[model samples]
Target chain A: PLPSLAPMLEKVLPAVVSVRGLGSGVIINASKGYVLTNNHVIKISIQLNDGREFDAKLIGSDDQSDIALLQIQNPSKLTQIAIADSDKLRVGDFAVAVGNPFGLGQTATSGIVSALGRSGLNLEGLENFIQTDASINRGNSGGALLNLNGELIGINTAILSVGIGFAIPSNMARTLAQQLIDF
Target chain B: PLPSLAPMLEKVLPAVVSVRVGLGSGVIINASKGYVLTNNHVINKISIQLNDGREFDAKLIGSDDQSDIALLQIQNPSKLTQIAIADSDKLRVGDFAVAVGNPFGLGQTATSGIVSALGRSGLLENFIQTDASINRGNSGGALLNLNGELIGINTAILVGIGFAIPSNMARTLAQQLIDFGEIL
Candidate 1:
């Protein structure tokens, strides 16, 4: 029984914007136009939901976590997603993957927390991922993994198998997000 | 913040069992009676192994594929523990949910998330949608509330969403299966 994600989508959809028509980016900081996405998703340009395009500068990126931070020219033009704790994640937890699939458009898929504390699966550095069985595609990297409360819990990073997708936990991504903001 | 599920997991861990036939999951619904509840598909295979490290042959008392539930009885009545059932109708979208099962032949495992949605009934009767990771061998496992009560039964995961048969409905079907020899 997959529930209707209409309300959840209505709330979080705006924060997920197309990244220069390449991939996806989440508005982590609405006040400063700080967007969080995959380092590979960036290419010097960013686009918001309202058809407005802006030049973005990479604040910082940790390839280890596959997370990148960018600054938008207009902070007031976007909404932000609330960052939540990923350390508290339990297997079977609801995970919502929101991103642009195959450069199509903003799409959302649902699944449960398949596993936690996943590491050493061919990724760089010490990585702890929130693994899920949600439908994650190539363009989904650098998207948002949200909870039922619509809080951002992880940054969609890599796909392991057909239905197995991994995201860098919000706790780790947040740590990096803070550093990028401060730096 | 994610709640420490360790306490809850410890309490319910003993009640979850691994079915040998289809390599799915089952729950001890009645400890004293040795009644196990799982998917009809899982029970069709005939073997159940509990965390207590005992294997026993089981008998399928009744089954309903429409609701995707089955009731079984084991050889021993008093040795195993049982999980208390919760009312799925009381579940809210943000309610904490935990799923325990043997996935991909992996030993007993647990995943926790929230009720992603409720009353999703397009394909099935009434399913409680969740994001808790349910995999190949998770079918027929227990979907528990934070209080260590069974709220639903893990059924299927399509695309990214995992669906569970609500306990309230499961209870009704089980009761009917026990009495009528088939889900009425």
Candidate 2:
């Protein structure tokens, strides 16, 4: 009777989507068809986990936070992921990363929160990050980093080294995404 | 509440040792006789420190370069904790895995992840791939299953992906080394 993440992934996987042209995004508002992704993953097309393609329009983007919002056109039957209070995250808490690395397909990797409040990466934006070891790769940008409870806590962003990947905390991402959507 | 691996890590941290051939890690396989296992490359020379700050001199028993396994015998054996070996063949992707090691010269650090894949080849024999953080000095450390059993030996890594030599292969080689040394 060993522990496995399969059960938890079943509920969380559908909320993640493949941002075509190579990146990943999470559904934040199913009714409004709002998808959250990195500023660098700008594209008009996205494929849901169910393989349905939809054209989306950029709602708004924030360069300082590297966060972007998109609204799918005439969307239907989408699943939105619940957001977690990222400030409540601890260094040793379990973390799960869902993404489409290398555009292969949806992949889930697990790790613990290695560090938090990490900054000064020399990136062109605000730098607070949640560092994890959950196997973030090139195509994992803008993917979801969830706590064990299947709540979004961060957005996968950059990799510093093997087993050292960084994510934008969901609190910051949520704030930035809300501002982007309002504007 | 966020789940933590700390409870399980309490039983695991002790078995992992920092091998000071400059920097590396090792696992205690047999406590009484003081048999330890590590990567061959890490043992060009060796001494080890336990999680409790106990230090001991270790001598290489035998080393297989191809498999990258080295067996060591601790001098002046005392009360020591050894790890239970799991059947790596049964390991499946998504199973919880934990890596305990001396990373970047840091002592007895533990990182948790899942078995990302199995039978990963092209990296000096088959390996158990995991998302666990295995850094520079993590070579020769323990890759354990949820039961705190040794499933593999952390050996190498590529960005966001780490590789560990399966315990089955390491166990076989360790046995051969012990048998061959006894006959010699």
Candidate 3:
């Protein structure tokens, strides 16, 4: 059988939503309507894959890591993505990026991990990133970088060059989101 | 186990060779005859280096500037690896794609992405749009499918997006070059 990412993206698409007019956010808690995104993308009301839009309140944000946690207002029937161990991610690992680029709705691109532990970009609070060739554009910030298992591994953050994009590690995003949830 | 493209690349890397003199890339299409396919713009003076460090002087068989396709004949034929060609008409958006080339004159480098668009035309007659990382000096390189088949010839880039001449178009032009010694 020919290899395809269709089956995996089917389950993943729903968990990634458009962030208002600018970026994207990942659903981390469907029950509580918790969404994770980049702090730079906080200027949103969240829109789901089915075109459902909900007002969201910012739980907290960290500038250094460029991570933000938000709570959806009375969300229902939302799907959340499982987090993967980003610490174990290695170069050459197949990666898929899902986001609402250029406000063109949810789009998915694929590539291999070009590099790991990328730092010193001076774009955000923290610099360690998972670099991939998967095309990431203006509106892709705060979207999800996933593994083949539909597991979230990173938060799409910035593009260093053409075919070179950086993402915040999932482990860091998870830790920050937890702290924001507690506060 | 997490998925990886290493296995497929092992077979593909050998089929893409670096074109010197002008600094581009070429895809081996006929190993027995030592025929390499590259872009017309990349072939001012031709020489090719295989992945295994073998080098050969090549003579331009024919070239079509309109299609940007060029066919080269190696001086002396020997055991060489050739890439399987895929019907570009079968390509679809979101299909897994890989690119191997000599970017910036850097040795054989590979990048991966999905087909972002298709049948794109403006600067070229027709193109296969992909999100794969095509950079300077990558022109005339190989754009492949996950099955290791040659699907497109890397041509241009804009930001993170790339464009390639479809393999079907390339094949037709290549055949004409081989038969007629020039495009008709």
| Number of the top TM-score candidate | 2
lDDT of each: 0.74, 0.77, 0.77
Interface RMSD of each: 5.8, 5.6, 6.0
| lDDT, residue B119, model 1 | 68
Q: How much RMSD separates candidate 1 from the native structure?
A: 8.3
Ten-residue region with minimum lDDT total, candidate 1 chain A? A118-127
Best by DockQ: 2
The local lDDT score (0 to 100) that residue A82 gets in candidate 3 is: 94
Residue A8: error of model 3 in Å?
13
**Candidate 1 true-interface contact recovery:** 0.11
Off by over 4 Å in 2: A1-92, A96-110, A114-131, A135-160, A166-183, B104-107, B111-126, B131-134, B157-161
Model 2 lDDT tens row, B61-84: 999877778899999989899999
**Residue A66 of model 3: what lDDT?**
75
Question: For residues A1-183, could you state the per-residue lDDT of candidate 3 as single tens digits?
Answer: 998988998878889988874788999888999988887765358878777778999989988767888899988999999999988875557888888644456678777765455221223432456767776766567889999898999988864535567788899888888888888
- lDDT (Cα, tens digit) per residue for candidate 3, span B55-159: 789998888877678889899978798999999999888898887764333244567888988864322647788777776445788998989899999875335
Tens-digit lDDT string for candidate 1 (B1-184): 4334556677787788877764678988888778888886655447887766678888888888777788888876557888999878888888878777753333445656678887644336477888766655467889998899999999863444688889898888877777786434
